């Protein structure tokens, strides 16, 4: 997260870190057994880390649970990042509490102009590299479809939306990938891609979760 703020320990209790020996992506806990992340975050041997604030220090509220299954969207295309969504099943159910909690899936898509909460442990520099210890947060508005397509001509599908600031300086970034965009208390986006981070006229691009609720529900009911 570039240009954001320190969330506060466990104030984003659905935020997970995906660890394969190191933090590499975020994700969102949607019930005690399932995490939503980006398909581009797929790899084998994922351990899901819940209840994290400082990802480098055991502070006492973490739950570390291995992934038992990862399901990449059937139509995921890594070249275009269309359908950049994956489900991760936990080997055992998380214990839900005040610091580890699920985020609701949307019943309707979110609206342009709504301020959403984006969070993660990704790079905090728009040029160069600096990674935070504690979870970072950014409030950013959903941009109009037309402005999103104007920023990324030929690259925005109906399964993507833009959020952020055309002036630059505030954005998600690498390492936030797979993490949540929460609007009005619902998971509406997944950190997906962008040109650089926090660059002028290049806002963040996010997977449009509301298009995937039927697939999520069917998949969870069968796995
Ligand atoms: Ca920790």
Domain boundaries, the chain: 5-7+103-211, 15-102+212-221
CA of 189 to the centre of ligand 1 (A): 25
Ramachandran category for residue 32: left, alpha or beta (phi over 0 → left; psi -120 to 50 → alpha): alpha
CA of 51 to the centre of ligand 1 (A): 8
Catalytic residue among 23, 40, 73, 192: 40
Say which CATH topology domain 5-7+103-211 has. Thrombin, subunit H (2.40.10)
Resolution value in angstroms: 1.4
Does 54 show up as a binding residue in the annotation? yes
Clarify whether 177 is annotated catalytic. yes
CA of 17 to the centre of ligand 1 (A): 10
Does 10 show up as a binding residue in the annotation? no
For domain 15-102+212-221, say whether CATH 3.40.50.11890 is its number: no
Q: Which experiment gave this structure?
A: X-ray
């Amino acid at each position: 997260i570039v240009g954001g703020y320190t969330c506060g320990a466990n104030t984003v209790p659905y935020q997970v870190s995906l660890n394969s020996g190191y933090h590499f992506c975020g994700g969102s806990l949607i019930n005690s057994q399932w995490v939503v992340s980006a398909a581009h975050c797929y790899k084998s041997g994922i351990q899901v880390r819940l209840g994290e604030d400082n990802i480098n220090v055991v502070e006492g509220n973490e739950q570390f649970i291995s992934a038992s299954k990862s399901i990449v969207h059937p139509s995921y295309n890594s070249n275009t990042l269309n359908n950049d969504i994956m489900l991760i099943k936990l080997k055992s159910a998380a214990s839900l509490n005040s610091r580890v909690a699920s985020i609701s899936l949307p019943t309707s898509c979110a609206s342009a102009g709504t301020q959403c909460l984006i969070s993660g442990w990704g790079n905090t520099k728009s040029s160069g590299t600096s990674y935070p210890d504690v979870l970072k947060c950014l409030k950013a508005p959903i941009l109009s479809d037309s402005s999103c397509k104007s920023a990324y001509p030929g690259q925005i599908t109906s399964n993507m939306f833009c959020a952020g600031y055309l002036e630059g300086g505030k954005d998600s970034c690498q390492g936030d990938s797979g993490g949540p965009v929460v609007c009005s208390g619902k998971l509406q986006g997944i950190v997906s891609w962008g040109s650089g981070c926090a660059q002028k006229n290049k806002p963040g691009v996010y997977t449009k979760v509301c298009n995937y609720v039927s697939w999520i529900k069917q998949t969870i009911a069968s796995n």
